[PDB]
Symmetry: D2
């Protein structure tokens, strides 16, 4: 009957960058699995759009504004969530060439800032899921490889730090996924990229979201420090 | 009236699980049965086969237990034919079947058997334009000798899984692996406890994994939701990484 | 022969850094070794002298833009541009890695101008020697990825960027470890011993040579066969 | 008498597949470092060419016939070397087959089985001596699948063997080349050659000599604490 190792009934989930594509698909997948979902965006229109998308899909929750680069915004948002809905025990971080260093540095510093803030709730509860979403393939190769290596190593370290508390930390590393950014790449670049994917097609956003939905379940309780590649067989290093 | 047009489930899929008579294999066979697959579990002896049939029955899983020796082309071909005749083509296949100088033989044998089984099942999956091959790594099984063997089997399995994934991807067949850590099984239950505390101290979750926790990961990789996951090795080790 | 090259080695006052400074000097380089205190700088100058190596000991703090820029200027004025640079100087697990990578970047970017002008260079990053496991694995993963990314950025200029990842090496920190910990560690090392500082230095000496000109973005593990992920 | 001040004076080195390109460049590097070098080929003409090349370069040694897929040929060749020159304590495996000789699997399977066979046969001499160097050469860059597979197999194998023989002061390492300038690669059309270079941060092909230098180092006493490693030599081009 129940597919109970898959229920997120009774959990509150925070998904950053939820207004489109992968973030949005994740927010819906978690809602469908029975979570209350808070999706975030950096603008008020993104927040409002998120709330509408959740509504249209029968997902209870909210859309709110959050800037992951700001301690103040982070602390305030978490307070607001606490007051109105409870503590988020599932957090999905989806909010991301002499910039190559600064980009990775900035993204890992924001993962850390959001993660550390949410850990206190998860520690009290003795339960938690942190899931970090890598960037979609789309100079570019250097940045992509660097961000992916930083994310894997970061995810594994943080997993080690918080594991005694029954909190898992994992990542998902997408490949070429069909989104707004990728639909408008020049054809040459899109056809070259397809030619390197053994499945011979782009991934759907829903196919990232499924993986996230699994990692957030009780069935993935012994998986931690892992980076799961979701790339149709195309591995870029 | 016996017709059944499934959507996004394993309902009606036929799944073959090697080494299904105990522990991880058995937990996988039941998980796939619970997800609605018809399950053929295999063992190398007739008593194992019979035990698998009984376990499936007791749990309300439709399917069968059969004898299969993954090191033999004949046994493989025969077993596949029998499954075709009686149940249909298996489109989900799960391959689950003392010093530091045993590593070579062991890994060589296991990879050659993965290849042999995989190649035989690919024809059915190609015709159907759909498939799931899931390879299960071995559990940690001892200091040094054990570490060498484990790391070697794991490195071979990852590289092999990725290469096969590449070869069959164009056919909407995924190939993935699961790399367990320290799982609570027959071997681990009887370890000296003095040692057991040393082991736990290397695992961030501070416990052994359950066989069911490997089975859940396999259940997910077999689903439609995991369609864009291929060539991956998913570690299920509670955060303990040994290479 | 590194005859005619100027080599900067950070953290050169003892152990691995010192053995590297001597190995490069033995290969004919002029060597600037650095330390964070004036006594370290002076000790370096004395070690170099006692071994017949031309060069200098200076004070440098790799976490400060000012100290970096100043030191490089001083080297330029007095000796020329360093075209071989060996970086051996170094809640908490995050801040440690973050700080060390921000220092590698800071030093590296500052020395790249000299190397670009010369169309030749060698940057070699030294990892740290073996809770402890987490820190070690994290610093190692960060170093590998960073070394590879930088390699990519500067490769067109015939500059190589590589790292060396030591295992259990006989130094000041490891000499005083409790026996239990030392015997546990040995049991995991296939060569059944600690490495010598000179064994890291030799790897660095090879990476600095013309023979290693096609090696870039690599992390070479020097650990007697003991791998931790 | 004439004693080289190089890293391998007094050592005997066996290099398989020494009759051209990378294997030949290794044989000459090890000879230039003072080793006595036995280079091997599968045919008598290859063996003879190797002997001529070594002579022309002032390298003491020999060219012999060896088939790494045959236990008999292996044992025989090793015995001949012992009798006539001494035990090879440096062994470089460069006699990898390719898809030319289902295939992706058989290639890697065959090559790892030959590495194991040669390695196990030379380990007795190295154990007696309490010293050794085994160095495996990966293949140079469908093609991506084969290349990544051969590389992953070689890396895991090298590390496992390193573990098995380490207590004996024997090191086992590999070298993983990228795009190297060889007979095959010079002739490529411009379009294909410029595309290739654009994927290599150094912006050029490697020379065979540049692989040979890395092997030379790993064979020395200075690399005594390096074992189980795969050293990539690819100008910054990484594929997996
Ligand atoms: C892959 O290339 C990079 C990697 C890292 N950092 C890490 O990989 C990393 C890995 C593991 C822990 C970290 C903690 C703080 C910062 N970084 C890390 C990095 O640090 C920001 C910068 C670059 Cl360019
Ligand atoms: C990457 O793909 C492969 C890898 C291997 N083997 C290994 O990866 C391997 C890795 C480590 C130890 C081994 C011992 C015996 C045979 N193989 C191994 C392999 O074995 C023949 C076949 C393929 Cl396709």
């Amino acid at each position: 009957l129940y597919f109970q190792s898959m229920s997120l009934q009774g959990k509150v989930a925070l998904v950053t960058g939820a207004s489109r594509g992968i973030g949005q698909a994740i927010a819906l997948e978690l809602g469908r699995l029975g979570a209350v979902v808070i999706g975030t965006a950096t603008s008020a229109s993104g927040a409002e759009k998120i709330a509408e998308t959740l509504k249209a899909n029968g997902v209870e929750g909210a859309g709110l504004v959050l800037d992951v680069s700001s301690d103040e915004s982070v602390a305030a948002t978490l307070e607001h969530i606490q007051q109105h809905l409870g503590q988020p025990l599932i957090v999905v971080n989806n909010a991301g060439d002499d910039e190559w260093f600064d980009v990775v540095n900035t993204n890992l510093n924001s993962l850390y800032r959001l993660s550390k803030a949410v850990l206190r709730g998860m520690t009290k509860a003795r339960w938690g899921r942190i899931i970090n979403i890598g960037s979609v393939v789309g100079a570019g190769q250097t940045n992509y490889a660097a961000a992916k290596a930083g994310l894997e190593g970061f995810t594994r370290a943080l997993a080690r730090e918080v594991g005694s508390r029954a909190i898992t930390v994992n990542a998902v590393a997408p490949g070429f996924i069909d989104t707004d950014m990728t639909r408008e790449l020049p054809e040459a670049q899109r056809e070259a990229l397809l030619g390197q994917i053994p499945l011979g097609r782009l991934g759907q956003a829903e196919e990232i979201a499924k993986v996230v939905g699994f990692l957030a379940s009780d069935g993935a309780a012994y998986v931690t420090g892992a980076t799961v590649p979701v790339n149709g067989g195309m591995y870029m290093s």
